[PDB]
Each structure stands twice: as structure tokens, then as C-alpha cells.
Amino acid sequence: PVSMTYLYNKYSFKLILAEYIRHRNTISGNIYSALMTLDDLAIKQYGDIDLLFNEKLKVDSDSGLFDFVNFVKDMICCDSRIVVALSSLVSKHWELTNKKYRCMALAEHISDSIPISELSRLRYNLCKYLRGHTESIEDEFD
Amino acid sequence: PVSMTYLYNKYSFKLILAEYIRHRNTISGNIYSALMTLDDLAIKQYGDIDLLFNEKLKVDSDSGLFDFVNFVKDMICCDSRIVVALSSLVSKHWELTNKKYRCMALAEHISDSIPISELSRLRYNLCKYLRGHTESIEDEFDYFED
């Protein structure tokens, strides 16, 4: 799922977000490489991500999935680009750690939990970056 | 894995509950056939379980795992019997609905989230049932009273 046609409505944009989160580790296509640039914001919000994951959220634990989601729940409304970056990074970690099943479990929930108006905003700013109007994926409302 | 001595080490028991929840649909052995009888309690507590899963929890939605866990959160200390019956039932459903990944994710969290006191209570009542001392799996405390 790589065509820009997936960017035009809420369902197929959710699919793209879900696919990015599930498969961050191995996924190819410009939409995804663009979304990767969101890491930078996640790093600015929290600091060292490895520290966030290994010492603070304890993401390798039997409860990592739920603790992570819980940590990120107020953010999905406020600023979805932080939570998709962070969700994609944790997913990658779980993938490389033989817990793929969490990748899927997280991706479906986070993508479907982003409120529709925040989702509209994300795609607006995504598309602006993707067609070259903006140096980075911003957070303007239309 | 599974066997009767594995009951009386706490990690070993966490692993049994986890295996039961993960694989309710295919799993074999008496500890597990015994744990299935907890369905009755879940049915007495909530009513028709298909109604619970399909109308109230919307268990097949993209949020089902988290709506399920959220529904069952307060019970993890209060009544582990119910939450293990209900977790294993929703796991079976997910396994049959092409979402095994949810079974895995659920088992690990629920089984590692039961407080150690409640873990003991459950094990004590299960063993009473397993030895034929009890008609069903109860919830008497595993220590003496006052």
C-alpha cells in the first residue's frame, strides 16, 4: 500500500497509518519514509527514546503494550504525529525482539483511535510535506 | 507446557494461566478442562456472553483488545476467576476470527497483572477442585481468618 490514493479518505489513511506502525521495521514507500521524519518530534518531546522505553515504560515487560498505550493516550488527541512516530518506534523494537504480535495489536488500535478531526489535520500536513510545500510535516489546521 | 507440580511455583502458575488464555481453543489437559468450568461464573456475572462481546464490548473492533482489558480491569484483584474465564473466552473468539495475535497479547498482560495474593487464592481453590474436595472452583482465602 504505497499509492497516494490511500491518502484521500479516512479509512484508507487509517490503513496506511496502521501499516506504518505494524511494519515500520521493513516497510518501503515514500509515504512511510515521510512518516519516519516524525521521529525527530518524538525525540524533542521525550528525550532519549531508548531510555523512555527501557527504564521508564519497561516495554519488554509482560505489560509493555498496555503501559505504552497508556503513556500515549492523551497524546493521540493533542498531537497524533508524536504518537504515530512513537508507536512505530516501539513496534520496530518489538519486531526485533520476537514480539511481532504486539506490533499488530498496537497498530490497529492506535490508527483507529486517532479522532477524525486530528486525523484530517495529520493528512493535511502530511500531504503538504509530501508535495514539497513544507520542509517538515507540520501541525496547522486547515 | 503443563503438569500438576507446576501449580505450586507462582511463576509456573502464571505460566499456566497464560497458556490457558492464549490457547483456550486447542489446549489439552485436566488443569485446563478444570479452568473451563469458570465459564459458568462469567455467565452468572454478565449474562449471554455473545451479547457481551458483540453488542457491549464490540470485541471485533480495532480497539477490542483494549476495550476488553479496560472492561475487565477492576476485576483483576477482586475476582480472578471471572477474568480468567472471560479472557480465555474472548481469546478463543479471536483465535477463530483470525486474530491470534490478540490472544498472545492478552494472555501475557492478564496473567502478569493478577496480584500475587490473588494468584494464591486462585491456585488454592483450583487444587481443592482438582483433588475432588470441592464441587467447583471457589474463592475461599488460602489462609486462616482473624
- Of B138, B143, B118, the C-alpha closest to B13 is B118
Q: How was this structure determined?
A: X-ray
- Burial (CB < 10 A; 0-12, 13-18, 19+), residue B91, is buried
For A63, the closest of B63, B66, B112 (CB atoms) is B112
Give dist(CA A39, CA A95) in Å, integer. 17
CA atoms within 13 A on the CB side of B104: 15
Q: What is the resolution of this structure in A?
A: 2.6
Q: Please indicate whether, in this complex, the C-beta atoms of A112 and B69 are within 8 angstroms of each other.
A: no
Q: How far apart are CA A124 and CA A137, in angstroms?
A: 9
Q: How far apart are CA B103 and CA B111, in angstroms?
A: 12
The C-alpha cell that represents B41 in the structure block = 461464573
CB A108 within 8 A of CB B62: yes
Strands (E), chain B: none
Q: Which residues of B touch A61 (CB under 8 A)?
A: 112
Contacts B100 to A, Cβ<8 Å = 101
Considering its fold, how many domains does chain A have in total?
A: 1
- Closest CB to B101 among A63, A104, A113: A104
Q: How far off is chain A from B59, nearest CA to CA, in Å?
A: 12
Distance CA B135, CA B132 (A): 7
- In B42-85 the beta strands, taken as DSSP E runs, fall at none
Give CA–CA dist A9/A12, Å, rounded. Answer: 6
Burial of A57 (0-12, 13-18, 19+ CB in 10 A): buried
| CATH code where residue A7 lies | 1.10.437.20
10 Å Cβ neighbour count for A28? 9
**Minimal Cβ distance to A105: which of B65, B112, B113:** B65
For helices A100-113 and A64-72, give the axis angle rounded to 10 degrees: 20
Cβ of B108 within 8 Å of Cβ of A66? The answer is no
> Which residue range is the domain that position B7 belongs to?
1-146
Residue A102, min C-alpha distance to chain B (Å): 6
Grid cell 489462609 in the structure block, residue? B143
